[PDB]
Design a protein around this ligand. Structure first.
Ligand SMILES: O=C(O)CNC(=O)C(=O)O
Ligand SMILES: [Mg+2]
Ligand code: NI
Ligand SMILES: [Zn+2]
Length: 331
């Protein structure tokens, strides 16, 4: 069995290997990359996502989210308070202000220590989940707006044609902006490209150990657990590496820098934080190996998780028994 310790693998495809996205994902899996839940892909030196980032300031962040924490430094939840719209140029200035800017630090490890010590005492503002793309239309390789769609994958594998679309999302971050512990909708893959700016630190639990994280989360968030049998779908809970180590939960960590891709694999729980002003682009995708994970994915039916239009068909076809209850949660 390849990668039996479930380490995060880093790949350096050549320009030739970067042509066929599906084939390269299947290659990485042949080497055991999925066992970590997360992989890093450094693009060939010849590749670029677009020519420059000099003209992005007028993108609108219609609903910036202030991430307010409750709890203790290593075990907290966050809620998202909606703020007034602002442009990317306005948000970048805000991120660089004395109130929000990255503190002085020695290295990524020192910054990670400072994040876990101090995150809860501040409320950073995240421009998340903005439909759109920063890939140039002429970029033909690993262009996250030109991937094969999940609807077409389900149709190719299972023969059933379904409604829905699959488009990318932009994330504008600042110091301390935080992504809570989650797997993807329907335990899909994700791919994330850091277009510009400061790094993003990731934590990940191997898919084969995901239920260990869930059991810890039910212990640490006991009211939330009673409310919903899949409350991590709410994407609000944080647990620090120190707490994970104290409770014997297997995980790994890695820092993504600008110009790098990360792939999350089906049922790979992940969480993380931004080091400073940055912009990422991410999208869900599927492969044949996902189908079995989609069929088994947990679902939130309490009403909190509220998701895209396109998840309807995935539940309806892959999880017909759960469909009625889940749809009640959506309505
Ligand atoms: O970058 C972020 O805030 C969160 N991204 C992801 O969870 C991802 O790409 O799956
Ligand atoms: Mg612009
Ligand atoms: Ni994710
Ligand atoms: Zn729920």
């Amino acid at each position: 069995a390849q990668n039996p310790n479930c380490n995060i693998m880093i790949f350096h495809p050549t320009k030739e290997e970067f042509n066929d996205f599906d084939k390269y994902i299947a290659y990485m899996e042949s080497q055991g990359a999925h066992r970590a839940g997360l992989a890093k892909i450094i693009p060939p030196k010849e590749w670029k996502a677009r020519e420059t980032y000099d003209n992005i300031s007028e993108i609108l962040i219609a609903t910036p989210l202030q991430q307010v924490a409750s709890g203790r430094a290593g075990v907290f939840t966050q809620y998202h308070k909606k703020k007034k719209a602002m442009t990317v140029g306005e948000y970048r200035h805000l991120a660089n202000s004395k109130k929000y800017q990255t503190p002085p630090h020695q290295n990524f490890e020192d910054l990670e220590r400072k994040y876990w010590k101090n995150r809860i005492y501040n409320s950073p503002i995240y421009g998340a989940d903005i439909s759109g793309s920063l890939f140039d239309e002429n970029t033909k390789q690993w262009n996250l707006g030109h991937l094969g769609t999940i609807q077409d994958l389900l149709e190719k594998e299972c023969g059933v044609v379904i409604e829905g679309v699959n488009t990318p999302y932009l994330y504008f971050g600042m110091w301390k902006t935080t992504f809570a512990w989650h797997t993807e909708d329907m335990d899909l893959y994700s791919i994330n490209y850091l277009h510009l700016g400061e790094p993003k630190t990731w934590y990940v639990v191997p898919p084969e150990h995901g239920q260990r994280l869930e059991r810890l989360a039910r212990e640490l968030f006991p009211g939330s657990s009673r409310g919903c049998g899949a409350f991590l779908r709410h994407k609000v809970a944080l647990i620090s590496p120190t707490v994970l180590k104290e409770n014997g939960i297997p995980f790994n960590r890695i820092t993504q820098e600008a110009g790098e891709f990360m792939v999350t694999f089906p049922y790979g729980y992940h969480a993380g934080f931004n080091h400073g002003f940055n912009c990422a682009e991410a999208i869900n995708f599927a492969t044949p190996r996902w189908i079995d994970y989609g069929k088994m994915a947990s679902q939130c039916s309490c009403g909190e998780a509220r998701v895209t239009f396109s998840m309807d068909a995935f539940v309806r076809i892959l999880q017909p028994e759960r469909y009625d209850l889940w749809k009640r949660g959506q309505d």
